[PDB]
Amino acid sequence: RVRDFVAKLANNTHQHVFDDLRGSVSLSWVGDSTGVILVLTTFHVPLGQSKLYRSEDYGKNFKDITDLINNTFIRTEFGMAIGPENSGKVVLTAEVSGGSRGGRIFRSSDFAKNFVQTDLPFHPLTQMMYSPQNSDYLLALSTENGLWVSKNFGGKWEEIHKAVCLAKWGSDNTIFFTTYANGSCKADLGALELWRTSDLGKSFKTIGVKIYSFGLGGRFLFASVMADKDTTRRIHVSTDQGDTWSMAQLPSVGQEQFYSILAANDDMVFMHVDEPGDTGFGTIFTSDDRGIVYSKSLDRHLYTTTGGETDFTNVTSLRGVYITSVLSEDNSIQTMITFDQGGRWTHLRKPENSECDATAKNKNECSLHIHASYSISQKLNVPMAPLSEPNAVGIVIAHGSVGDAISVMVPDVYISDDGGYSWTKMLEGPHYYTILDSGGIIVAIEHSSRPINVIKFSTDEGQCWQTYTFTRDPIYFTGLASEPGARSMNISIWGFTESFLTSQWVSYTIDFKDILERNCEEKDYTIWLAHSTDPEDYEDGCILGYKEQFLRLRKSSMCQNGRDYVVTKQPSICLCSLEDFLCDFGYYRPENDSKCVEQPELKGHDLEFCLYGREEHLTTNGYRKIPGDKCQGGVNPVREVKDLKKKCTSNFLSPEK
């Protein structure tokens, strides 16, 4: 539908040939709206040399800047540590000789235009980590497990602690780190201490003992803590940097189980707890807004002990939507989706014009299943996992199969433009895919064993496609790079050409600026209610107590949203109902439509929580607003609050007070 497209692309396609790119090759973008890309290489000659290339134009042209690093061998293990935001910081870690006291880094503050070499008073063991508040503050662990901090972008270091296993930056330049006191990190597991320093090593506070590990998610600090006189451990949560802790209402686990924070934001967390006896699955729980009371969201959630692969995916392009895989009772794998932050999970709706595959019991009734990390790890023919971007609202693209379970067959690519409610087959056969200019353009490359020289693109969100031949020397295709954030109209195609005699790495960068030659205006956008189920209901669209309508680009408009495009939306607040509340600790919601009632008996970890929980959390009316829930007016449960503590501890003989 695009006219003269070949002529509009041909003078905007840019080839670069890399003279040498053997070994591990990596690419990092430096900053937003800079067009800066660094390509680094590392190979050994076994019976070490590194190459560094830099673009400042979104990959159209590179310059060999290997000379800047004195042709030194860069260790790929540490990668390029790119600083936050647009600080323009880059640190590369070098291999030193065997004589050396400490290692060596090459540091740049101007987007890798210039580097200086700095010799370290230690040998780094981890990648260097920037404070998110301050790109000049770095921390790093040494090979001797010292924790070292720098206040001047790695110019000078000081070791603030000697026996450290893990360290991370919190907010406001805070450091949390675990320490061992006995022998090694591994032999002191479960008896580590957790420390905090708010002032870069001047003061410390020990905020936990008998630690196994710790992590940060949203507003929460999580620590797993081992029960003394025991081999099991439990999660404890703090929202004040470990000044105070509460036990979370979650099962304890043995040494062969794990917890994993699937996703976390300012409101809540999704926690996975592995099932006992390494069955390769566990259960998803969602927290309230305190990170303390957890609701079982999804049983038999697939998460493998080998490598730790899970299909859990936030569909970033529609609020509330997540997708994952679960094991059926027959041990086939199905895809499930939730539209309300894990309150309910369902099968994905089959594309109207799809045929049910061989996994389907019924040839007229089946569902869509999605290939993701686990499929890829099992060596299925799946080039990419599912793609969605916050700024291209409603769009999700993924390889999938239509049936009753995930198939081993070669998959096709499906797209949804409503956040996952409905799907269509987008392309036949496996492809690599990218979204450019906030959904203004979708691009795809065929995944082949033979060389390719065509790229497909759509300006109407994957409904109609045009094919451009971007080279007359077909390449073995390796990968697509585009600027993080999906707001660019540049896409780079990477691969290599092979002859009998020789081969060579090549990139082609294509600029769509002449296809999308006009800016979108107000008339190019149309109102769209997200989550619509039934247009006859005044509450159609309500999720977590509010609806949103978006101004979405019309499919038929062919125009650029723009690098400064802002997703325009307008909320409507829904009335509160009982569905906007979670059962608080001690209560549940039996068979039907939504009244939280006292549990008759507390067993298992509920019983543990009652004995170990604070009054604050044990005093309740049985309801708590779903976190992120924005309803106003309507039902407001007025049952009076009671201490459930008295209920359980009532059975126990108490010792003297």
Partner: peptide, 4 residues
Amino acid sequence: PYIL
């Protein structure tokens, strides 16, 4: 994801 983040293991504990």
